[PDB]
Amino acid sequence: LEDLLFYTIAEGQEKIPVHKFITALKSTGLRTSDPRLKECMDMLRLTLQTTSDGVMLDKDLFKKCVQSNIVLLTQAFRRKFVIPDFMSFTSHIDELYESAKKQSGGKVADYIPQLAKFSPDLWGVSVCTVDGQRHSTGDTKVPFCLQSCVKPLKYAIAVNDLGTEYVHRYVGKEPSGLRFNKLFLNEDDKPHNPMVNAGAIVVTSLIKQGVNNAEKFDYVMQFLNKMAGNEYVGFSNATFQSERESGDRNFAIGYYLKEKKCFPEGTDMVGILDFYFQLCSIEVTCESASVMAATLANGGFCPITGERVLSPEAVRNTLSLMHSCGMWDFSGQFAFHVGLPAKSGVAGGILLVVPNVMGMMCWSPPLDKMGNSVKGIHFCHDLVSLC
């Protein structure tokens, strides 16, 4: 019934060219590399190479072929997605991109000298929604590190594995009010939130306490690959050798936490700190990070594969934490102006989240003095002012 509906949308011809069939199929934003339509793409190849004719659509083959992806095609082609007129949305995104390109900023990275090798004019924005509508511009294919942008993800790991009460037995859930590098605890001698460095160290201590570092990294990498829909998730070893021989404030924070005895029993501080460095050393592209902040923009389900990834409790908790203290000292101003859950990092990534609507990633090596990208902040302000 969907093929005759599309024929009614068509100009009255039974046969339509495939190279024109892909048009108005990408106009709704659904890409041709979706694993949901992997059966559709392989059957389309099997029809395309073994015809030598072209301009062939057919109706009975289209009826008998797809039985589970019919609902996705009907939702996409009837403008039943969350965001219609996606060409206009991409036009707005491109206009905001060109407006934010005028800013200059500066001061990319003093410490972590491997991070200072990026040119200051790099700029890219990726967009991915709940249904699977995705679009990206700029330098979205260039890999970049996930410094401090993995902290909400690893907090979700800890919560979904061990229960929120056991997770918050060792950490608080309040904003610190100071820089993330500054070391101090609350009245109960605990880190203020998982987003600061001390809370990140403590929540790395929780994940899979009974196994070695290799199995821990394998588990978190496999699960994050499941969350990303098997996208590109690398590991920048060049930025891991740096920040290990040059990152001294994190070592001081870890030794302070060890001295304050706020660790789980039978835990080695040095190995946990090295594991935290390894988690900070993960690198993804902007397109790959568009799938990030979109599984948690949904109800814990992957926007592309639809698999069960995170429990809704973990997603709600990490969304609340990102809304509260996800932008260091700029969190209050960000909630005042933008009012959306977002996480930043010294690499230049912004994990902007719109709940139940869409996800977004912005990448810009220049940084503000508080540790946030100026171009991404201006882009977010323009986006919340326009839409």
For residue 344, the 8-state DSSP code is B
Which does residue 250 bind out of a copy of itself, ligand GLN, none, counting CB within 5 to 8 angstroms by kind? ligand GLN
Q: Report the C-alpha gap between 148 and 136 in whole angstroms.
A: 22
350 - beta bridge partners? 344, 362
Give 168: exposed, middle or buried? Use CB within 10 Å, 0-12, 13-18, 19+. middle
Q: Is 284 helix (H, G, I), strand (E, B) or coil?
A: strand
Catalog residues that contact a copy of itself under the rule CB under 8 A: 19, 52, 54-55, 113-114, 117, 212-214, 217-218, 221, 234-242, 245-246, 278, 281
Q: Which is nearer to ligand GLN, 123 or 275 (CB)?
A: 275
Longest dimension (CA), the chain: 77
Amino acid of residue 377: I
Asked if residue 148 binds ligand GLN (CB under 6 A), the reply is: yes
Evaluate whether 201 touches 216 at the Cβ level (below 8 Å): no
Residue 198 and residue 172 in contact, taking contact as beta carbons nearer than 8 Å:
no
Is-contact 364 375, C-beta < 8 A?
Answer: yes
Minimum gap (Å) between residue 386 Cβ and a copy of itself: 29
Our finding on whether 146 is near ligand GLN (CB under 6 A) is no
The dihedral through the CA atoms of 361, 366, 368, 369 has a sign that is positive
**At closest approach, how far in Å is the CB of 115 from ligand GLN?**
8
What DSSP letter does each residue of 169-199 carry, written as one string? TT---S--SS-SS-----TTSS-S-TTSHHH
Least distance (Å) from a copy of itself to the CB of residue 218?
A: 5
Looking at the DSSP bridge assignments, the partners of residue 138 are 124
**21 touches, from ligand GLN, a copy of itself, none (C-beta below 5 to 8 Å by class):** none
Q: Which stretch binds ligand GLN (CB under 6 A): 6-14, 241-249, 282-290, 295-303?
A: 241-249
Nearer to a copy of itself, 11 or 165 (CB): 11
- For position 250 contacting ligand GLN by CB under 6 A, the verdict is yes
> Burial code of 106-128, b = ≥16 C-beta within 10 A, e = fewer?
eebbeebebbeebebebbbbbbb
In a 10 Å sphere around its CB, with 0-12 CB exposed, 13-18 middle and 19+ buried, how is residue 41 labelled?
A: middle
CB of 247 to a copy of itself, least distance (A): 11
Q: Answer yes or no whether residue 147 interacts with ligand GLN by CB under 6 A.
A: yes
Residues in region 102-131 near ligand GLN by CB under 6 A = 112
For ligand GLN, the binding residues in 264-303 under the rule CB under 6 A are 280
Select from a copy of itself, ligand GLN, none the partner in contact with residue 55, using the beta carbon and a kind-dependent cut-off of 5 to 8 Å: a copy of itself
> Which of a copy of itself, ligand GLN, none binds 147 (CB below 5-8 Å, type-dependent)?
ligand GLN
- Binding partner selected for residue 24 from a copy of itself, ligand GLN, none, CB under the kind-specific 5 to 8 Å limit: none
Single out the segment in contact with ligand GLN by CB under 6 A; choices: 159-167, 244-252, 334-342, 374-382.
244-252
- Helix H or strand E segment including 91: helix 86-100
Q: Give the Cβ contact number of residue 216 at 10 Å.
A: 20
Between residues 53 and 265, which has the closer beta carbon with respect to a copy of itself? 53
- Is residue 308 within 8 Å of residue 301, measured between CB atoms? yes
> Does the protein bind ligand GLN through residue 243 (CB under 6 A)?
yes
Considering only CA atoms, which of 321, 344, 318 is closest in space to residue 174? 321
E strand segments, 49-169: 124-129, 134-138, 144-145
Per partner kind, with CB cut-offs from 5 to 8 A, the member of ligand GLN, a copy of itself, none near residue 114 is a copy of itself
Regarding 197 and contact with ligand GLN (CB under 6 A), the answer is: yes
Residue 236 contact among ligand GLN, a copy of itself, none, beta carbon within 5 to 8 Å by kind = a copy of itself
Considering only residues 345, 348, 349, 366, which one is a binding residue for ligand GLN as defined by CB under 6 A? Answer: 345
Which residue ranges make up the site for ligand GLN (CB under 6 A)? 112, 147-148, 180, 197, 243, 247, 249-250, 280, 345-346
